[PDB]
Amino acid sequence: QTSAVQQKLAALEKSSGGRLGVALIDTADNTQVLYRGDERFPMCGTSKVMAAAAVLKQSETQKQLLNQPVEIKPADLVNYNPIAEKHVNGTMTLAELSAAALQYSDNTAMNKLIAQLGGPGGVTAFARAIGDETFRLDRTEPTLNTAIPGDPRDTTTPRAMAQTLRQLTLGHALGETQRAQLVTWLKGNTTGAASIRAGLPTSWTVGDKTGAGDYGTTNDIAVIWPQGRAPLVLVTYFTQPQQNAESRRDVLASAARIIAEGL
Numbered sequence: 001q002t003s004a005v006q007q008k009l010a011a012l013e014k015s016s017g018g019r020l021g022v023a024l025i026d027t028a029d030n031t032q033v034l035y036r037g038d039e040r041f042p043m044c045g046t047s048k049v050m051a052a053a054a055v056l057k058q059s060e061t062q063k064q065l066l067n068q069p070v071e072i073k074p075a076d077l078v079n080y081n082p083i084a085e086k087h088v089n090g091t092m093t094l095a096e097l098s099a100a101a102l103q104y105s106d107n108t109a110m111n112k113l114i115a116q117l118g119g120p121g122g123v124t125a126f127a128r129a130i131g132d133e134t135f136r137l138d139r140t141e142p143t144l145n146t147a148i149p150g151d152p153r154d155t156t157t158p159r160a161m162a163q164t165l166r167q168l169t170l171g172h173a174l175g176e177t178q179r180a181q182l183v184t185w186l187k188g189n190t191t192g193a194a195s196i197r198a199g200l201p202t203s204w205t206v207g208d209k210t211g212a213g214d215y216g217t218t219n220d221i222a223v224i225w226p227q228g229r230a231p232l233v234l235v236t237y238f239t240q241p242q243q244n245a246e247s248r249r250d251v252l253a254s255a256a257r258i259i260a261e262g263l
């Protein structure tokens with residue numbers, strides 16, 4: 001059985017030609033609205049939130065960890081390194097790496113976060129530690145974005161990622177200082193204007209992390225503070241049947257617009 005919300009999302013999905021996954025959590029009453037909420041989707045860059053959060057968790061017991069400089073070698077650079085390329089034969093702190101990964105989608109920066117955690121398995125272990133039983137990170141950048149049909153690697157479900165993003169940004173999966181830091185990073189994201197943000201009232205404060213990959217995979221996860229009501233968490237995942245499909249950030253904006261109706 002479906003609600004009008006789910007029917008609108010299904011119609012959007014059909015018109016888009018792809019596969020859409022949505023999870024909304026309204027913290028006013030802890031209700032969820034889901035569309036393909038328990039299907040796996042390739043996370044691509046939305047996985048950078050889990051890696052940054054894992055390092056924040058480490059820093060709760062290692063207080064200067066975020067300010068630890070990490071060497072950036074020429075050999076570290078991968079396919080998209082807008083911030084890290086400014087620091088080749090130099091350093092970035094774990095805070096700077098987190099900001100670059102989250103706010104500029106820097107893939108080299110993500111690889112340093114992954115390395116700090118001991119590899120993709122370290123990121124997954126953090127996910128399990130905060131109660132996310134679904135998330136899995138298997139690969140480093142750039143191959144974690146291959147988004148191959150049927151491939152379980154580097155996937156999660158909309159429901160799981162929404163629950164986790166809520167716990168990280170509004171709940172207490174992290175310490176208070178670290179939660180605030182993650183919120184600050186997400187709020188300052190530079191890559192999200194055309195995605196969930198484009199489908200929501202401009203007066204709402206939004207923190208988000210985008211992701212993109214092959215199969216026209218177009219993703220965004222967001223924490224949302226509407227004017228005068230409890231915050232929301234929204235995950236919108238989208239992927240398409242053919243490997244070189246075009247990005248569709250408009251589909252994410254449309255999904256957000258549908259979800260926002262009545263709120």
Ligand SMILES: CO/N=C(\C(=O)N[C@@H]1C(=O)N2C(C(=O)O)=C(COC(C)=O)CS[C@H]12)c1csc(N)n1
Binds near residue numbers: 044
């Ligand atoms: C093998 O890797 N292939 C990638 C890829 O690097 N995806 C990563 C990902 O997510 N990224 C983000 C991200 O984390 O959102 C953005 C966003 O950056 C900007 C400026 O908005 C830039 S691409 C990078 C890819 C991307 S699209 C396609 N067919 N493939």
